[PDB]
Amino acid sequence: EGVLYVGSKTKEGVVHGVATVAEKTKEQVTNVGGAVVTGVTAVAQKTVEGAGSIAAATGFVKKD
Amino acid sequence: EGVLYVGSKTKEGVVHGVATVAEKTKEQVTNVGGAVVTGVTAVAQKTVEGAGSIAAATGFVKKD
Amino acid sequence: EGVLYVGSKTKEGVVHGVATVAEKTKEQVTNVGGAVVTGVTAVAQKTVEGAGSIAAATGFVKKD
Amino acid sequence: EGVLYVGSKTKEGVVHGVATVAEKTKEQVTNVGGAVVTGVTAVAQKTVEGAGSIAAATGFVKKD
Amino acid sequence: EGVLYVGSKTKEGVVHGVATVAEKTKEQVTNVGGAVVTGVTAVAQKTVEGAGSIAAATGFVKKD
Amino acid sequence: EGVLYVGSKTKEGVVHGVATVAEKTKEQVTNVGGAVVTGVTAVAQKTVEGAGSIAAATGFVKKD
Amino acid sequence: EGVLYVGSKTKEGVVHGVATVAEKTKEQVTNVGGAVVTGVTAVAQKTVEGAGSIAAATGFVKKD
Amino acid sequence: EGVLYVGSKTKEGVVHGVATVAEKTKEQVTNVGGAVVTGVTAVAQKTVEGAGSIAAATGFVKKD
Amino acid sequence: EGVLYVGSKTKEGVVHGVATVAEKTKEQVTNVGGAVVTGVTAVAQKTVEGAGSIAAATGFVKKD
Amino acid sequence: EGVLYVGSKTKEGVVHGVATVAEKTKEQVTNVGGAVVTGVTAVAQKTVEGAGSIAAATGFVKKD
Numbered sequence A, B, C, D, E, F, G, H, I, J: 001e002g003v004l005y006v007g008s009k010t011k012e013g014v015v016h017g018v019a020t021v022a023e024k025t026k027e028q029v030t031n032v033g034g035a036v037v038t039g040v041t042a043v044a045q046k047t048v049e050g051a052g053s054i055a056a057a058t059g060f061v062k063k064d
Ligand SMILES: [Cl-]
Pocket: A016, A017, A018, A019, B016, B017, B018, B019
């Protein structure tokens, strides 16, 4: 069964993850369906184990 | 059964995770469905074990 | 059954997690469905074990 | 049954977790569905064991 | 069963992940269906194990 | 009249001064005419003010 | 009159000064006429003010 | 009158000054007439002010 | 009157000064008339102010 | 009156100064009349101010 070995060496790391910036705007969205993982070493793992599973990411919905 | 081995060495790390910045704006969103994990070493693991599971991330909804 | 081994060495770490900043704005949201984990070493683990489970993250909803 | 081994060595760590900052704004939200964990070593673990479980994080709702 | 071995050595890394920037705009979206993983070493793994699974990423929907 | 301004800032310093090491040897010498100054900040100042002054450093002398 | 301004900033320094090492040898010398100054910041100043001054450094002398 | 301004910034420095190493040898010399200054920042200044001054560095002398 | 301004910035420096190494040899010399200055920043200044001054560096002398 | 301005920027420097190496040899010399200055930034200045000054560097002398 699967192995997610991650091995990392660095002397320096500078990391900027997600920046959302707005001036004088309307209706700005940064929808993320999964995790937001930010690191010198960064690992995201997701397992969905079943039938009929739904993953549904939407920025915005406007009905009338 | 699966192994998420993460091994990390660094001398320095500088990490900025999620920044959401607004001036004079309306309706600004940073919806995240999973975790927000921020680190020199950063790991997010999610397991969903079942049938018919729903993951549904939406920034915003406007009905009438 | 799964192993989440995380091994970390660092001499220095500077970490900034989630910043939400607003001036003169309206309706600003940073909805996070999971945990917010911020660390020199940062680990988030979530297990959902069942059928029909729902994960539903939404920034905002406006009905009439 | 699963093992969340976390091993950490650091000489220095500086960590800033969640900042929510507002000036002259209205309706600013930092909804977090899980824990907020902030540490030089930071670990969040959540287990939900059952069928039909709901996780539902929403910034704000406005009906009429 | 599959192995996702990642091995990394670097002396320096500077990483900027996702930037969404808006001025005087309306209706700006950066919908991401999976994780957002940002790192000097960055790994995202997703496994969906079942029949009839849906992955559905949409920027925005407007009905009337 | 002269100014020996020394200004130093360091976060870490490791300093090894004078090592003299011998195994199974004969007649090993580390003659130093001035001071031996060893420090994270190290300053040696010597002033000789007169006529006919002698400075004479010799490791060893063997007459018959 | 003269100014010996020394201004130093460092984050790390590792310094090894004078090593004299011998195995199974004879008659090994490290004669130094002035100071031995070893430091992350290291300054040696010598002033000789007079006529007919002698500086005479010799490793070894053997007459008969 | 003269100015010996030295200004230094470094993040890291590793410095090895004078090594004299001998195995199974005879009559090995490292005569130095002035100072031995070893540093991340290293300054040696010598002033001799007079007539007829002698500086005389010799490794070794053998008369009969 | 003269100015010896030295201005230095470096991120890393590795410096090895004077190495004298001998195996199974005889009569090995590293005579240096002035200072030995070893540094990430290294400055040697010598002023001799007078008439008839002698600087005389000799490795070795053998009379009969 | 003269100005010896030295201005240096480097990201990395590796410097090896003077190496004298001998195996099974006799009478090996590295006579240096002035200073030995070794650095990422290295400056040697010598001023001799007078009439009839002698600078005399000799490896070795053998009379009978
Ligand atoms: Cl960021």
